[PDB]
Each structure stands twice: as structure tokens, then as C-alpha cells.
Amino acid sequence: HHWGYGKHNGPEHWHKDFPIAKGERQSPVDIDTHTAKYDPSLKPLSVSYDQATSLRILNNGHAFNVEFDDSQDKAVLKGGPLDGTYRLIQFHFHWGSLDGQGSEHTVDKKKYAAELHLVHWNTKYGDFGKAVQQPDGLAVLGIFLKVGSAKPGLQKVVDVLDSIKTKGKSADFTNFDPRGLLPESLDYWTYPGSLTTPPLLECVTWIVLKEPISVSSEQVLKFRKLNFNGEGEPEELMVDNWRPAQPLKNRQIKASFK
Numbered sequence: 001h002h003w004g005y006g007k008h009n010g011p012e013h014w015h016k017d018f019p020i021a022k023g024e025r026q027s028p029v030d031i032d033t034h035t036a037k038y039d040p041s042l043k044p045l046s047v048s049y050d051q052a053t054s055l056r057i058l059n060n061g062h063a064f065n066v067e068f069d070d071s072q073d074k075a076v077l078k079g080g081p082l083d084g085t086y087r088l089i090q091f092h093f094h095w096g097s098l099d100g101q102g103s104e105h106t107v108d109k110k111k112y113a114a115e116l117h118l119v120h121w122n123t124k125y126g127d128f129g130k131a132v133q134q135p136d137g138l139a140v141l142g143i144f145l146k147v148g149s150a151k152p153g154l155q156k157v158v159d160v161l162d163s164i165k166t167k168g169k170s171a172d173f174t175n176f177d178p179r180g181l182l183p184e185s186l187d188y189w190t191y192p193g194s195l196t197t198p199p200l201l202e203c204v205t206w207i208v209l210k211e212p213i214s215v216s217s218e219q220v221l222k223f224r225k226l227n228f229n230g231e232g233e234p235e236e237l238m239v240d241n242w243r244p245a246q247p248l249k250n251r252q253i254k255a256s257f258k
């Protein structure tokens, strides 16, 4: 009886094994655009992905992760609300069964079709396992997906999904450029939060881009052909792998833009 996104093991149950689920800095949250305040002290975000070295794509039974070589600083996130250097380790998505749901963060209660998380760890803590034990250990760059025009830079990801249909499958995924997943603008919202899956650790500085990327209906339909289950088990389509918005509590969401 492991955690997941079913009726019996979904987000409303997680608190029994992970009591931090009811904590003071849980993610995701609703972003109320009329309450978020422009902070002139923030900086321009620095997304440096030119030298990124992707290695593998894995179906972990919850999502699919594109993993990077993090054994040196190549692909790094700096600036914005961040002190120091955060190394890109993986990206993944959350998505829905239909286009009207799928994002984790919401914007004035609007749910997008999906959300991309680019996960980075603070290199002052030496390894990612040490970083997640710290309040400033991770930085997650969140990007909304809406359905419209295809995203060219997403198609290489779409086309390998058939090879990792079930939990525990992986495939070689070298030479993928994550720059192809970004919108034009780097305008963002930021707040202190958590991992959105167990173990729900309160170690994340969230940076959520205001501008969504457009993907095609055919692109997200292929996400929805993935399976939660392992090979040889009853098919459970990988859909609705999102946690809903959590209470904001004693937190402020800051805007990078006026």
C-alpha cells in the first residue's frame, strides 16, 4: 500500500506516512495574482543550460524523469531569489486526464493542462541527498503547459515515451537540450515550499514562470499513454499525477515583474 495518485493512496492519504504533508511550507499553492507583490530586490534569473548533459529517461511509476550528469557544474540556475549555485539534476512533468487539469500550482485557481519541474540542488551542500535536508537545498523551476501549438523542443521527449511505458523502464536519453522547453519570458513568482511528492520535504525555493509554454493535443495525449503499473500488471494509465494546492499559511508569494 505505497503512495500514489489513486482513490486509495492519493494525496489525501499521504499525511499518514508523511506527517509533514500538513506542515507550514507545503507545495504546490494557488498563486493569487492580485496578492503577490512585485519585489524590486529580486534579480534576473540566470538559466545556464548550454552545457547540459542529459543521460537517461526513467518511468518511476509516478512520472517520467529526464536525468542529467550533475558530477560537475554545467547546467545551473542562479540569481532571482537564489543565493549561490543550483545544479540541474532532472526534469519531470505532472499532467491531467483532460486538458482542464494537470498542473500543481494554480494561478487565480486556474489549472493548466500540465506543469514542468526542472529540479536543481544547492551545490554548497555537496550532494543532493544532503541538500534535501536543508531549507534552501533545492530550487525548482516550474513551467505551465497549455494545449495549442506543438512545442518542437518537447517532441524528442514525446517520441521516446513508447520505450518507457511501464514503471521501472528506462532508456538512453543523451544530448537533449532543455532550453527548448522554456518560454520567451523569465518573469516569475517565487515562494518557499516543499517537494510535491513524498517525502514532502520543506527544502524548495519555488520559481514559477508566469508565461506558459504551448504543447499540442497530440503531445499531451502521448503523456497520457504512459502507465503507473509495471510490465505484466493490470494497466493503469499515468494521468492526474498532480497534488492539489496546499494552504499558504505564513508565506508571501513575490513577483519578479511590475
Ligand SMILES: NS(=O)(=O)c1ccc(CCN(C(=O)CCl)[C@@H](C(=O)NCc2ccccc2)c2ccccc2)cc1
Pocket: 065, 067, 068, 069, 070, 089, 090, 117, 119, 121, 128, 129, 132, 140, 194, 195, 196, 197, 198
Ligand atoms: N515535484 S517536485 O519537483 O517537487 C520533486 C519531487 C521529488 C523530488 C525528489 C526526486 N528524486 C527521487 O524521488 C528519487 Cl529518484 C531524486 C531524483 O530524481 N534522482 C534522480 C537522479 C539521481 C542521480 C543523478 C541524477 C538524477 C532527487 C533527490 C534529491 C534531489 C533531487 C532529485 C524532486 C522534485
Ligand SMILES: [Zn+2]
Pocket: 092, 093, 094, 117, 196
Ligand atoms: Zn514535480
